[PDB]
């Protein structure tokens, strides 16, 4: 935000935001233009984020601007888990408890895998997902 | 005075009395015996609280029925006027009766005044000092204290001499005044916050603001059987819709939104670490939600309610589970979503007012979280953060207003507005947008207390028209009438300076700017009064930012040494500490030989409480016309919700409004009918509005006064002052205007029933 936008345009708050200092799926921090353009052209490289690993991958990326990339991980995980649970069995029958239990279900698995503290249901919530998929597959 | 209204004695406390009273007598019985709204305009010349106090008080122990009275006032500064004048009439209605009272009426403020703890007493924010001693006095503290013998928890041991020995009974039988109060509860060392608290089924009347009246946040304990039979009073209520809008509006700042941020991300550290150590009791209250809204905690609360209740009181509540909210990681999930959501909002390049609906569905369409759900975060937070038992509130206060906004904003809809600026235009071109949210029918908070109640008295000095607050708040009194102030003398010149010694037509609405074309000759017009008047002399601008701007140029000008060379000179000032030791030692130097001259504004908090005697009150300035689209079009988007509401436009409204502030100043110029003082005022729109005045106010212009020269006023004062300052004393018609002790009442109306 005000320091941390770039590994080139760090101080890119009052430095004309306009380019997308967008976020890889898969690498969850601010890359600038300057920076993110350099890199899905070639292919799947990473990016030196204050020294950053992480992978930036090919044009695949999605738009998080300045909507608390973590918060919008956790709620890309409740995106997640409403996109696992896009097509689950709440209201098949009506029943508003049911539902409300249903919903806590979802957001527990959510929950498990948007806080990483202790998370090994967050690796369960993904098998449930996949059984989840496995159901919505099936 | 010991007369009657056919009805019920009248012990009246002074000698003399007043044409106006008695007619204020006859229609105040009248109304109490049909309870009613009877919207009345007394002069505020007259004191009506006299009226006022004395008939309701022989009301109570004339008829029996209604033991309960409630008098609800602009300023705890008037309550503290009423305080006093009630003891004053508690004592001579004892004191012409003998020991009849047996009775118990006591003042409400806040618990910054009256919490009596030094060190919370010590602190500055009222937020603290109510939250402090909250904290200091809490139900759960002391358990941590009472359970666990530790210093960690200290008291504020008034609370506690208060389970002592006040919560057994009342302070023993006075009509305590503020000071009154204070003396005797610091002697007992007792507390009068906690003290109203208790006493809230006890006391036989009750005197405080209008927010405890209005503010459900602090309206939420209301106990009907001081309520229910009771008789509502309210004086100068004429600027409280603003204050109904204002107590449903709420700003916003994206600073906040970070401290939001900053309160809600150290929730996830709070509910996390005590959910390593005791999730149990986390888990318990989660069946405390699967069984409801947990009511059997997060309302018998002594001293643990976290979140109060920022919506109306508990009127527009669901009890049920929150569904998958039940968690208080889920809890603060949404809440995380919904803040960067808000955030995603706030970030709006432009000013956008967003239906409460299309933007509920927007952040439905962004973030699915459903709108009944979303009022029970005040609940919640409330429940959450004392199991949490939380050690701070500051990293936390951003929050509550979240939980204030989210619940009122998901049970509010097509009465209130969000709209989102994207900075402030008095400092525009930098990011500092405002989420800015408010209601737009004032008479909403207001339905509930009509519900209530049947008996509710309402007056003011100012009120013009007595009609528009019918159709603003949409209501049916019974008796809309004004009162004329009976005075053989004039004792107060009306002036509409809109030609100046230039004969300029000179206006505030041109701009918030100067012109010294308008300017200056306003500072040569002003600079000739600071000889003539004596100590005594305040003005009143539009606009604090408009003060100052013609301040610093009349500042450059050679004009302000003369005043000083005239009289001695007293700011507004931003914190009313300042402001407050310059109206004293004002007063003081208007009490003292030199003279004194103020200045302030028309919307400034000093025409809201703060009366001025005859020497106190001199000559009162209008700078222009009060007029407040300064501002953005937020007053408009009201206004335009007026305009669809209600078929009342802008400038009649405007008008209707700026000279009810304006009048709301001129009030204070006076305190009875030995008090006098020349009402000069400056804009050429002022000819225009003779008919907006109220009644005596109007009566008391005469057209000849109209667009008069600053010149010629200065002559037209000039006699006046030397004939007031002269001992008018005839003492034959005076009786006319005083309706002579206890005879010219008893026999001119008792001649008059015809
Ligand atoms: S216990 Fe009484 S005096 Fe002490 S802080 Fe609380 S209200 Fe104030
Ligand atoms: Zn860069």
Known sequence: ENKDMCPICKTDRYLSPDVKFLVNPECYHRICESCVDRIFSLGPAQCPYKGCDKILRKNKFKTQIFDDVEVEKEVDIRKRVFNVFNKTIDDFNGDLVEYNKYLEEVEDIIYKLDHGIDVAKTEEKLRTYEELNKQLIM | ?754
């Open chain 2, 1 to 754: 005075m010991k007369f009657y209204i056919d009805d019920l004695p009248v012990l009246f406390p002074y000698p003399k009395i007043y044409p106006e009273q008695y007619n204020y007598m006859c229609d105040i019985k009248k109304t109490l015996d049909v309870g009613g709204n009877s919207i009345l305009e007394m002069p505020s010349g007259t004191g009506k609280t006299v009226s006022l106090l004395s008939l309701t008080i022989a009301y109570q122990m004339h008829y029996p029925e209604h033991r309960k009275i409630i008098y609800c006032s602009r300023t705890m500064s008037e309550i503290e006027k009423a305080l006093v004048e009630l003891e004053n009439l508690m004592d001579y209605r004892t004191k012409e009766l003998g020991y009849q009272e047996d009775f118990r009426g006591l003042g409400l403020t806040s618990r910054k005044n009256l919490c009596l703890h030094p060190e919370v007493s010590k602190e500055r924010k009222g937020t603290v000092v109510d939250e402090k001693c909250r904290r200091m006095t809490n139900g759960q503290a002391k358990r941590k204290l009472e359970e666990d013998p530790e210093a960690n928890v200290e008291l504020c041991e008034y609370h506690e001499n208060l389970y002592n020995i006040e919560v057994e009974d009342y302070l023993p039988k006075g009509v305590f005044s503020f000071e009154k109060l204070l003396k005797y509860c610091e002697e007992k060392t007792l507390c009068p916050y906690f003290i109203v608290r208790r006493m809230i089924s006890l006391c036989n009347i009750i005197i405080y603001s209008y927010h405890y009246l209005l503010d459900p946040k602090i309206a939420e304990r209301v106990s009907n059987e001081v309520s229910k039979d009771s008789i509502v009073i309210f004086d100068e209520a004429h600027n409280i819709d603003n204050v109904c809008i204002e107590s449903l509006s709420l700003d916003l700042t994206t600073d906040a939104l970070r401290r939001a941020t900053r309160g809600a991300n150290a929730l996830d550290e709070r509910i996390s670490e005590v959910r390593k150590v005791d999730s149990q009791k986390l888990q318990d209250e989660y069946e405390k939600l699967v069984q409801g809204l947990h009511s059997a905690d997060i309302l018998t609360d002594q001293e643990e309610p976290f979140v109060e209740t920022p919506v109306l009181p508990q009127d527009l509540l669901t009890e049920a589970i929150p569904g998958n909210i039940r968690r208080a990681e889920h809890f603060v999930s949404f809440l995380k979503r919904l803040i960067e959501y808000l955030k995603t909002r706030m970030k709006v390049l432009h000013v956008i007012s967003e239906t409460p609906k299309s933007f509920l569905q927007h952040l439905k369409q962004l973030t699915f979280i459903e709108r009944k759900p979303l009022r029970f975060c005040s609940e919640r937070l409330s429940l959450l953060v004392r199991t949490l038992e939380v050690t701070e509130v500051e990293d936390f206060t951003a929050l509550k207003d979240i939980a204030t906004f989210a619940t009122l904003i998901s049970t509010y809809e097509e009465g209130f507005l969000l709209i989102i600026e994207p900075y402030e235009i008095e400092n525009a071109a930098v990011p500092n947008p405002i989420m800015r949210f408010t209601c737009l029918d004032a008479s909403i908070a207001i339905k509930p207390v009509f519900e209530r109640f049947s008996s509710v008295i309402i007056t003011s000095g100012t009120i013009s028209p007595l009609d528009m607050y019918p159709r603003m708040l949409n209501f049916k009194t019974v008796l809309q009438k004004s009162y004329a102030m009976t005075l053989a003398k004039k004792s107060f010149l009306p002036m509409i300076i809109t030609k100046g010694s230039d004969q300029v037509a000179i206006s505030s609405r041109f701009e918030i700017r100067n012109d010294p074309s308008i300017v200056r000759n306003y500072g040569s017009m002003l600079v000739e009064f600071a000889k003539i008047t004596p100590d005594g002399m305040v003005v009143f601008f539009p606009s604090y930012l408009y003060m100052e701007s013609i301040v610093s140029m009349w500042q450059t000008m050679g004009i302000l040494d003369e005043v000083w060379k005239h009289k001695l000179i007293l700011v507004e000032t931003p914190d009313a500490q300042e402001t407050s030791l310059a109206l004293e030692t004002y007063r003081k130097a208007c009490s003292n030989g030199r003279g004194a001259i103020l200045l302030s504004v028309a919307r400034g908090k000093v025409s809201e409480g703060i009366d001025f005697d005859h020497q106190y009150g001199r000559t009162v300035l209008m700078i222009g016309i009060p007029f407040q689209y300064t501002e953005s079009r937020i007053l408009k988007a009201r206004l335009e919700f007026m305009r669809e509401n209600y078929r009342i436009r802008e400038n009649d409204f405007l008008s209707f409004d700026a000279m009810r502030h304006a009048a709301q100043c001129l009030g204070r110029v006076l305190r009875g009918k030995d008090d006098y003082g020349v009402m000069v005022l400056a804009d050429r729109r002022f000819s225009r509005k003779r008919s907006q005045l109220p009644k005596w106010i109007a009566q008391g212009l005469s057209d000849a006064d109209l667009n008069l020269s600053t010149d010629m006023a200065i002559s037209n004062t000039k006699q006046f002052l030397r004939t007031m300052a002269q001992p008018t004393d005839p003492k034959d018609q005076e009786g006319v205007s005083v309706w002579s002790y206890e005879d010219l009442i008893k026999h001119q109306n008792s001649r008059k029933d015809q």
